Design a protein around this ligand. Structure first.
Ligand SMILES: CCCCCCCCCCCCCCCCO
Ligand SMILES: [Fe+2]
Ligand SMILES: [Fe+2]
Length: 220
């Protein structure tokens, strides 16, 4: 349990996934800072927080004597990451904000909070510090999208349709290794659906709209 060979194998993929995720979050928020001049300094602050998270999780892996399987993690994020990239190239800020500040942050919040109670004491302290920042990142995107809801609504719907299923696939792909780390799938699914559904309601979506938007992920 922590030093077991089964735990260490699963941690190799999970730890690689969180590190790769933080690294991409870093790049994502820097690109967003390019696209949103009025919030350029705030977004740069979010990016610097991501760099800290990445470093903290690299340390978690070293503490369990685990080599992160980065190749597995690259492939894990590829589709969703390339979608961000493409949206960024076409100037689609709304899509980029949805992917990184809503969908990805909600996923991280739900998984990290599930990991905390079963995490070794060193990783538990790191993750507690990390999840504190994730609330702020999600709050940034919700606040912006809520303030710009009418202009953003049509693109949000389209972005959700294309990208929510990718994250569900990512949630499903990670479920086995997560269980080995003592994180139950059913907790992950419920918590992610609740957080993302609640964030959509806060932004301004109706119930039928939230059910429609959620169902694109769940049917995948
Ligand atoms: C060592 C941490 C354990 C939790 C593992 C969670 C399993 C997969 C979810 C990964 C989500 C990473 C997203 C990071 C984005 C940060 O803004
Ligand atoms: Fe982060
Ligand atoms: Fe984040």
């Amino acid at each position: 349990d922590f030093q077991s060979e089964s735990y260490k194998d699963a941690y190799s993929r999970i730890n690689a996934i969180v590190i790769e995720g933080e690294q991409e979050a870093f790049d994502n928020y820097n690109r967003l800072a390019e696209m949103l001049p009025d919030q350029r300094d705030e977004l740069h602050k979010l990016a610097k927080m991501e760099q800290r998270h990445m470093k903290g999780f690299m340390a978690c892996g070293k503490n369990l004597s685990v080599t992160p399987d980065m190749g597995f993690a690259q492939k894990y994020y590829e589709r969703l990451h390339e979608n961000f990239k493409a949206a960024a190239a076409e100037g689609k800020v709304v899509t980029c904000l949805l992917i990184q500040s809503l969908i990805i942050e909600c996923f991280a919040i739900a998984a990290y909070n599930i990991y905390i109670p079963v995490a070794d004491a060193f990783a538990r302290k790191i993750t507690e510090g990390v999840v504190r920042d994730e609330y702020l990142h999600r709050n940034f995107g919700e606040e912006w999208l809520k303030a710009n809801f009418d202009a953003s609504k049509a693109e949000l719907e389209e972005a959700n349709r294309q990208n929510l299923p990718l994250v569900w696939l990512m949630l499903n792909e990670v479920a086995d290794d997560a269980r080995e780390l003592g994180m139950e799938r059913e907790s992950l699914v419920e918590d992610f659906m609740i957080a993302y559904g609640e964030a959509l309601e806060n932004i301004g979506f109706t119930t039928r709209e939230i059910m429609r938007m959620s169902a694109y992920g769940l049917a995948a």
